Amino acid sequence: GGSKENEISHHAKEIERLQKEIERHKQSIKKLKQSEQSNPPPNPEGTRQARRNRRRRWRERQRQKENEISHHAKEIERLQKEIERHKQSIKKLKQSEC
DSSP states (O other), X not given: OOSHXXXXXXXXXXXXXXXXXXXXXXXXXXXXXXXXXXXXXXXXXXXXXXXXXXXXXXXXXXXXXXXXXXHHHHHSOOOOOSOOOOOOOHHHHHTTTO
16 A cells, blocks of 8 residues: 555445435435424425425435534444333233233
C-alpha cells in the first residue's frame, strides 16, 4: 500500500452495501416508526404530485445523507441486552379456551 484511498476502498466495500441498504431497511422500519413519531405530512394543498415529485429529488440523497449523521448517533446508544423479560405462554391456551 501507500495511499489512503487504498484503505478507504476496503471499508467502502462493506460500507457501500450498508449506505445503500439503509435506504430500504430504514424505509421498511419507518412504517412502524411512524406510529411512534406520529409526524404525518401537511394537509392536501397545491398539488400532492408537485411536492411528491419535487421531494423525490431530496429524499433521494437524504436517504444516504441522513444515514451519515446517524452513524454518529448510533455510536452512542443505550444497550438493551440481558434484561428482565417475561414469556406469556398461557395466552396460547387461554386464547384457545379448549
